[PDB]
Amino acid sequence: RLVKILLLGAGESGKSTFLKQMRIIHGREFDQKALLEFRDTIFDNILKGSRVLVDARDKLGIPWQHSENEKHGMFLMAFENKAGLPVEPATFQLYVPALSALWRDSGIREAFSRRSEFQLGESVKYFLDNLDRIGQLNYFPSKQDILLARKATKGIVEHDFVIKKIPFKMVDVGGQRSQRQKWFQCFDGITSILFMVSSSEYDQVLMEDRRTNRLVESMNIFETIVNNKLFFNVSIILFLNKMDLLVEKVKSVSIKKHFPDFKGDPHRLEDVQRYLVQCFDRKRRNRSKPLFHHFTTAIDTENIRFVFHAVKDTILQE
Ligand SMILES: Nc1nc2c(ncn2[C@@H]2O[C@H](COP(=O)(O)OP(=O)(O)O)[C@@H](O)[C@H]2O)c(=O)[nH]1
Ligand code: ALF
Ligand SMILES: [Mg+2]
């Protein structure tokens, strides 16, 4: 009896990131082929994010700290890998001097602070924050770099493990409006659904359209999955993810602006935490059996090992 788990949720919620934590913990570690692929991604992640940051402070009018940096900004503008792939260490090292200089500019860091005014996977900060060893000539990625790297899932990927002598099989699929269209192929013979939610995204708008709120979409999707006949004999467990990023936003940006019906203290983590559980609780018609849920940080490996051992129980006991 091989347990089939399905990883669902909106775009940029941490589905793939979770699936990585599974391989690290329960699967076989990555051979150079995959490792180099992760690096290409990391390099790319760093180059595309900066391009956006350099264009951000321009399109928002923010001035430079040191106006010399213009010329560093120039060096990134014409970078492009849209629908492209391998980005080699030689390529990247040319940009290291530019990247470090720009990142030091307070004008740019301020542009990163107004991130939510546009589209940028904040995973950029971590890399530029330790560009010093990424930008070293003989660099290989760490586990933590890898987990923080980002590639948009444009397909489906089964991933097999045997945890405590029980054969698991997890499927990762894409979360964007375009990709959802594929989901129905994976609904076959699933024993559970791990629904994920980028809980830090109350102030952000969805990428694939300028206007729809990211967290509302998550709720909208959850409502449709959780109340489905097809998934009547299926365990459904909710992962409020990016808890470590959430902590940060809570301090500076308020959810009150975006969710006016919120009635608590907008700068207390738990006031906000409980509200989220409730919102997702509320989209369920069968609020009789309780809402299995966790507050995860999918980049933090221990958190996940802990959290998954619990999830393994919930599922198997049902
Ligand atoms: N800080 C933080 N970042 C996360 C977490 N989970 C995922 N990420 C980042 O979010 C980005 C999107 O992850 P991914 O798994 O590809 O999202 P997906 O589209 O749902 O598969 C990656 O760059 C990850 O580094 C988390 O718990 N905390
Ligand atoms: F939901 Al994705 F890449 F955005 F798996
Ligand atoms: Mg993905």
UniProtKB/Swiss-Prot annotation:
Q: Where is the signal peptide?
A: none
- Positions of region (G2 motif): 145-153
- Locate the residues binding Mg(2+): 16, 153
Please provide the record's keywords in A-Z order: Cell membrane, Cytoplasm, GTP-binding, Lipoprotein, Magnesium, Membrane, Metal-binding, Nucleotide-binding, Palmitate, Phosphoprotein, Transducer
**UniProt-annotated stretches for the region G1 motif:** 4-17
What is the topology of this protein in the membrane according to its UniProt annotation? Lipid-anchor
PTM comment: the record says: Myristoylation of mutated N-terminus in place of original palmitoylation restores the transformation activity.
Question: Which compartments does it reside in?
Answer: Cell membrane; Lateral cell membrane; Cytoplasm
Tell me which family the UniProt entry assigns to this protein: Belongs to the G-alpha family. G(12) subfamily.
Q: What does this protein do?
A: Guanine nucleotide-binding proteins (G proteins) are involved as modulators or transducers in various transmembrane signaling systems. Activates effector molecule RhoA by binding and activating RhoGEFs (ARHGEF12/LARG). GNA12-dependent Rho signaling subsequently regulates transcription factor AP-1 (activating protein-1). GNA12-dependent Rho signaling also regulates protein phosphatese 2A activation causing dephosphorylation of its target proteins. Promotes tumor cell invasion and metastasis by activating RhoA/ROCK signaling pathway and up-regulating pro-inflammatory cytokine production.
What protein name is recorded for this chain? Guanine nucleotide-binding protein subunit alpha-12
Q: Which organism is it from?
A: Mus musculus (Mouse)
